[PDB]
Amino acid sequence: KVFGRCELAAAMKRHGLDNYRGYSLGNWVCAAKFESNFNTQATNRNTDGSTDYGILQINSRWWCNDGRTPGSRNLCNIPCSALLSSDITASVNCAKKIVSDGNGMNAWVAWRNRCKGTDVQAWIRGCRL
Numbered sequence: 370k371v372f373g374r375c376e377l378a379a380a381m382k383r384h385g386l387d388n389y390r391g392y393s394l395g396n397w398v399c400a401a402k403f404e405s406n407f408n409t410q411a412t413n414r415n416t417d418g419s420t421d422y423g424i425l426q427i428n429s430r431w432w433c434n435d436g437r438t439p440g441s442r443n444l445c446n447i448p449c450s451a452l453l454s455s456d457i458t459a460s461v462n463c464a465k466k467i468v469s470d471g472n473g474m475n476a477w478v479a480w481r482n483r484c485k486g487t488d489v490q491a492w493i494r495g496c497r498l
């Protein structure tokens with residue numbers, strides 16, 4: 370599913386992401402936009418053999434199992450395929466685990482290079498929240 374900007378914002382807010390670990394809603398919508406262009410079915414393979422999945426491009430090296438990333442962890446306890454669902458619940462729950470691990474949203478390269486230090490509030494501006 371390809372989310373609308375406001376539609377995803379409302380979805381993320383409902384799942385408890387607004388202000389989660391101090392990150393305002395705008396930060397999450399911004400990350401999703403530049404990681405996956407709001408496409409739940411986005412996948413991208415990395416040089417180390419791992420793959421990033423879903424709206425938040427969560428990595429199979431640590432967070433989910435895709436059966437093809439030798440010696441990897443599954444810290445979210447889920448199949449990576451579950452991160453591609455139209456229902457963002459799995460991705461949200463796993464992202465909460467990732468942002469809690471100590472590096473905050475810096476774990477998302479796109480967020481660090483394109484959202485951090487920017488007016489992220491612009492990503493939810495005009496939305497009925």
Ligand SMILES: [Cl-]
Nearest residue numbers: 390472473474
């Ligand atoms: Cl932080």
Ligand code: NA
Nearest residue numbers: 429433441442
């Ligand atoms: Na894995």
